[PDB]
Amino acid sequence: VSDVPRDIEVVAVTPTSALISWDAPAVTIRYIRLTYGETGGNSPVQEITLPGSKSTYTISGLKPGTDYTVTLYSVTGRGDSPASSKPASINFRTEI
Amino acid sequence: VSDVPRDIEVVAVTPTSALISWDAPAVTIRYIRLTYGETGGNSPVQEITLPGSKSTYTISGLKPGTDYTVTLYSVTGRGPASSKPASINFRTEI
C-alpha cells in the first residue's frame, strides 16, 4: 500500500528558496507532481510537474520568513487524468 | 487522525541544531513524544516527551551537514493511547 515519494526532506533554505529532496518509491512513476504554497494561505497553490526520474527540486520566488507547505504526488498512470499516489508533504520556513 | 500533531515544520536549521514546530491537534492530549535520529542510520535515536501544550522544540547537539529524521506522535489518557506518528526530514547546515 501507498507508494508516495519517500523521505521528503528540506535540504537547504534561503530567504527566497528551498532545496527539497526525496527518494522515488518502489513502483515506476511517469512523473512527480509537486505543489507548494504558504501554509494555511487561502491563495492559489503553485504546481509543477517533474520528470519521474528527478529526486530534487529547488523552489524559488518565495517570500522571506514565510511558512510553506510542499506536497508531492507520484503520477504512475497515463492520460489527462493519470493514476496518482496519495499526497506526501513537509513544511518549512524560508530565512528572513 | 485528529490526534496527530499538525503541520510539523522545520522552522530553521544551523550546523548543530534545528527548530521544529507543529500545531497542537484539535483534541485534548497529555504529551507529545518527539523522536529524532540520523535518517537511515545505525546511530542512536533519542526520544523526548513534551507537555501536550508545547508547540515547538529545538534539537541541538547535532552534526553539521547531516540528514536527520524527526517523528512526532501524541499521547492522550491516564496511565495511554497514541496517535499514528508524523515525521519530517531535514539536513543541518554544513
Swiss-Prot record, chain A:
UniProt PTM comment: Sulfated.
Compartments it resides in: Secreted, Extracellular space, Extracellular matrix; Secreted
Tissue and organ distribution: Expressed in the inner limiting membrane and around blood vessels in the retina (at protein level). Plasma FN (soluble dimeric form) is secreted by hepatocytes. Cellular FN (dimeric or cross-linked multimeric forms), made by fibroblasts, epithelial and other cell types, is deposited as fibrils in the extracellular matrix. Ugl-Y1, Ugl-Y2 and Ugl-Y3 are found in urine.
Domain of life: Eukaryota
Motif (Cell attachment site): 78-80
Every Fibronectin type-III domain range: 4-96
Function: Fibronectins bind cell surfaces and various compounds including collagen, fibrin, heparin, DNA, and actin. Fibronectins are involved in cell adhesion, cell motility, opsonization, wound healing, and maintenance of cell shape. Involved in osteoblast compaction through the fibronectin fibrillogenesis cell-mediated matrix assembly process, essential for osteoblast mineralization. Participates in the regulation of type I collagen deposition by osteoblasts. Acts as a ligand for the LILRB4 receptor, inhibiting FCGR1A/CD64-mediated monocyte activation. Secreted by contracting muscle, induces liver autophagy, a degradative pathway for nutrient mobilization and damage removal, and systemic insulin sensitization via hepatic ITGA5:ITGB1 integrin receptor signaling.
Associated disorder: Glomerulopathy with fibronectin deposits 2: Genetically heterogeneous autosomal dominant disorder characterized clinically by proteinuria, microscopic hematuria, and hypertension that leads to end-stage renal failure in the second to fifth decade of life. Spondylometaphyseal dysplasia, corner fracture type: An autosomal dominant form of spondylometaphyseal dysplasia, a group of short stature disorders distinguished by abnormalities in the vertebrae and the metaphyses of the tubular bones. SMDCF is characterized by flake-like, triangular, or curvilinear ossification centers at the edges of irregular metaphyses that simulate fractures. These corner fractures involve the distal tibia, the ulnar aspect of the distal radius, the proximal humerus, and the proximal femur.
Subunit structure: Mostly heterodimers or multimers of alternatively spliced variants, connected by 2 disulfide bonds near the carboxyl ends; to a lesser extent homodimers. Interacts with FBLN1, AMBP, TNR, LGALS3BP and COL13A1. Interacts with FBLN7. Interacts with COMP. Interacts (via type III repeats 9-14) with TNFAIP6 (via CUB domain); this interaction enhances fibronectin fibril assembly. TNFAIP6 may act as a bridging molecule between FN1 and THBS1. Interacts with TNR; the interaction inhibits cell adhesion and neurite outgrowth. Interacts with FST3 and MYOC. Interacts with SVEP1. (Microbial infection) Interacts with S.aureus FnbA.
UniProt protein name: Fibronectin
